[PDB]
Design an enzyme around this catalytic site. Structure first.
Site, PDB file in Angstrom:
ATOM      1  N   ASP A   1      11.509 -10.410   0.471  1.00 12.52           N
ATOM      2  CA  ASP A   1      10.914  -9.298  -0.261  1.00 12.52           C
ATOM      3  C   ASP A   1      10.425  -8.208   0.682  1.00 12.52           C
ATOM      4  OD1 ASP A   1       9.622  -7.620  -1.992  1.00 12.52           O
ATOM      5  OD2 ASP A   1       8.139  -9.089  -2.636  1.00 12.52           O
ATOM      6  N   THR A   2      11.233  -7.170   0.819  1.00 13.72           N
ATOM      7  CA  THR A   2      10.914  -6.028   1.695  1.00 13.72           C
ATOM      8  C   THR A   2       9.728  -5.211   1.169  1.00 13.72           C
ATOM      9  OG1 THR A   2      12.593  -4.701   0.601  1.00 13.72           O
ATOM     10  CG2 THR A   2      13.277  -5.950   2.523  1.00 13.72           C
ATOM     11  N   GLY A   3       9.418  -5.346  -0.129  1.00 12.36           N
ATOM     12  CA  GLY A   3       8.281  -4.654  -0.720  1.00 12.36           C
ATOM     13  C   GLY A   3       6.949  -5.369  -0.558  1.00 12.36           C
TER      14      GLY A   3
HETATM   15  C1  LIG Z   1       9.553  -8.962  -9.847  1.00 12.95           C
HETATM   16  C2  LIG Z   1       9.890  -7.729 -10.632  1.00 12.95           C
HETATM   17  C3  LIG Z   1      10.614  -7.870 -11.813  1.00 12.95           C
HETATM   18  C4  LIG Z   1      10.945  -6.748 -12.567  1.00 12.95           C
HETATM   19  C5  LIG Z   1      10.549  -5.484 -12.144  1.00 12.95           C
HETATM   20  C6  LIG Z   1       9.825  -5.339 -10.959  1.00 12.95           C
HETATM   21  C7  LIG Z   1       9.425  -3.951 -10.533  1.00 12.95           C
HETATM   22  C8  LIG Z   1       9.496  -6.463 -10.193  1.00 12.95           C
HETATM   23  O1  LIG Z   1       8.773  -6.335  -9.030  1.00 12.95           O
HETATM   24  C9  LIG Z   1       7.375  -6.040  -9.129  1.00 12.95           C
HETATM   25  C10 LIG Z   1       6.568  -6.628  -8.005  1.00 12.95           C
HETATM   26  O2  LIG Z   1       5.354  -6.635  -8.107  1.00 12.95           O
HETATM   27  N1  LIG Z   1       7.223  -7.116  -6.946  1.00 12.95           N
HETATM   28  C11 LIG Z   1       6.508  -7.710  -5.817  1.00 12.95           C
HETATM   29  C12 LIG Z   1       7.184  -9.065  -5.580  1.00 12.95           C
HETATM   30  C13 LIG Z   1       7.149 -10.015  -6.773  1.00 12.95           C
HETATM   31  C14 LIG Z   1       8.292 -10.749  -7.095  1.00 12.95           C
HETATM   32  C15 LIG Z   1       8.297 -11.632  -8.178  1.00 12.95           C
HETATM   33  C16 LIG Z   1       7.148 -11.787  -8.957  1.00 12.95           C
HETATM   34  C17 LIG Z   1       5.999 -11.057  -8.632  1.00 12.95           C
HETATM   35  C18 LIG Z   1       5.999 -10.178  -7.548  1.00 12.95           C
HETATM   36  C19 LIG Z   1       6.755  -6.808  -4.602  1.00 12.95           C
HETATM   37  O3  LIG Z   1       8.158  -6.775  -4.377  1.00 12.95           O
HETATM   38  C20 LIG Z   1       6.300  -5.356  -4.733  1.00 12.95           C
HETATM   39  C21 LIG Z   1       4.785  -5.169  -4.713  1.00 12.95           C
HETATM   40  C22 LIG Z   1       4.552  -3.663  -4.530  1.00 12.95           C
HETATM   41  C23 LIG Z   1       3.122  -3.253  -4.237  1.00 12.95           C
HETATM   42  C24 LIG Z   1       2.131  -3.374  -5.209  1.00 12.95           C
HETATM   43  C25 LIG Z   1       0.826  -2.977  -4.921  1.00 12.95           C
HETATM   44  C26 LIG Z   1       0.491  -2.460  -3.672  1.00 12.95           C
HETATM   45  C27 LIG Z   1       1.478  -2.331  -2.702  1.00 12.95           C
HETATM   46  C28 LIG Z   1       2.790  -2.718  -2.986  1.00 12.95           C
HETATM   47  N2  LIG Z   1       4.279  -5.838  -3.511  1.00 12.95           N
HETATM   48  C29 LIG Z   1       3.251  -6.685  -3.548  1.00 12.95           C
HETATM   49  O4  LIG Z   1       2.667  -6.974  -4.584  1.00 12.95           O
HETATM   50  C30 LIG Z   1       2.846  -7.250  -2.204  1.00 12.95           C
HETATM   51  C31 LIG Z   1       2.547  -8.765  -2.186  1.00 12.95           C
HETATM   52  C32 LIG Z   1       3.668  -9.579  -2.819  1.00 12.95           C
HETATM   53  C33 LIG Z   1       2.310  -9.287  -0.770  1.00 12.95           C
HETATM   54  N3  LIG Z   1       1.708  -6.511  -1.636  1.00 12.95           N
HETATM   55  C34 LIG Z   1       0.379  -6.851  -2.166  1.00 12.95           C
HETATM   56  C35 LIG Z   1      -0.611  -5.732  -1.804  1.00 12.95           C
HETATM   57  C36 LIG Z   1      -0.454  -5.197  -0.386  1.00 12.95           C
HETATM   58  N4  LIG Z   1       0.948  -4.828  -0.315  1.00 12.95           N
HETATM   59  C37 LIG Z   1       1.942  -5.617  -0.676  1.00 12.95           C
HETATM   60  O5  LIG Z   1       3.011  -5.536  -0.115  1.00 12.95           O
END
Ligand SMILES: Cc1cccc(C)c1OCC(=O)N[C@@H](Cc1ccccc1)[C@@H](O)C[C@H](Cc1ccccc1)NC(=O)[C@H](C(C)C)N1CCCNC1=O
Lengths: 99, 99
Positions: free
Chosen positions: B25-27
């Site tokens: 997960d690059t995000g």
């Molecule tokens: C999983 C999914 C399904 C359908 C549609 C979407 C958009 C989906 O993805 C939504 C999602 O939250 N994906 C997360 C991983 C995901 C996959 C499957 C289920 C649930 C989640 C992750 O990739 C992105 C999201 C982005 C983000 C949010 C808030 C602040 C900053 C960044 N990143 C984070 O939450 C990360 C965590 C994981 C360490 N994160 C937390 C804070 C600090 N920054 C940061 O990087």
């Protein structure tokens, strides 16, 4: 481009004449953008993340210019903490993970 | 290997003798795993995603074998809907995005 991951992988995107940055996010199925004016009909949807769920507006067949590349697909709009480019659009720019 | 993004990018990981799959997960800045028994001290932490925030246990200098290869880093453990390998470990397996 090849991008390493020491920093968050942001790219510039252009949508409906507006510019923003968004995270290239392999852990996201879908693309979600902060509240913006996109024209036309939409559908209510809810997306689940790490802390729970969020209500969004689903817009279909939206043209997105990602790093200049033009692609078309579904974009979700709502109170997201970050603009995210998910796999639905990443596949359209030929994005791969390599390791 | 090279991984396209038509499907979710899962890999097999081994941690403290236990096997599981996790999303590359690059995000994600950080790595979060479902409730498991990791031995030793930890620190209370909250991570914020879409939907809001989640309480986790932070474990440091944890050995992770990601697709058979060994890395060491911080792992968060808690009520996550998905095991996620974040950039903190992706950088250690030489992971790049190519597009
Ligand atoms: C999983 C999914 C399904 C359908 C549609 C979407 C958009 C989906 O993805 C939504 C999602 O939250 N994906 C997360 C991983 C995901 C996959 C499957 C289920 C649930 C989640 C992750 O990739 C992105 C999201 C982005 C983000 C949010 C808030 C602040 C900053 C960044 N990143 C984070 O939450 C990360 C965590 C994981 C360490 N994160 C937390 C804070 C600090 N920054 C940061 O990087």
């Amino acid at each position: 481009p090849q991008i390493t991951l020491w920093q968050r992988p942001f790219v510039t995107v252009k949508i409906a004449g507006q510019l923003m940055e968004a995270l290239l996010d392999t852990g996201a199925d879908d693309t979600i953008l902060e509240e913006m004016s996109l024209p036309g009909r939409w559908t209510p949807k809810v997306v689940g993340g790490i802390g729970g769920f969020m209500k969004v507006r689903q817009y279909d067949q939206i043209l997105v210019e990602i790093c200049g590349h033009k692609v078309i697909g579904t974009v979700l709009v709502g109170p997201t903490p970050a603009n995210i480019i998910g796999r639905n659009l990443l596949t359209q720019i030929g994005c791969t993970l390599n390791f």
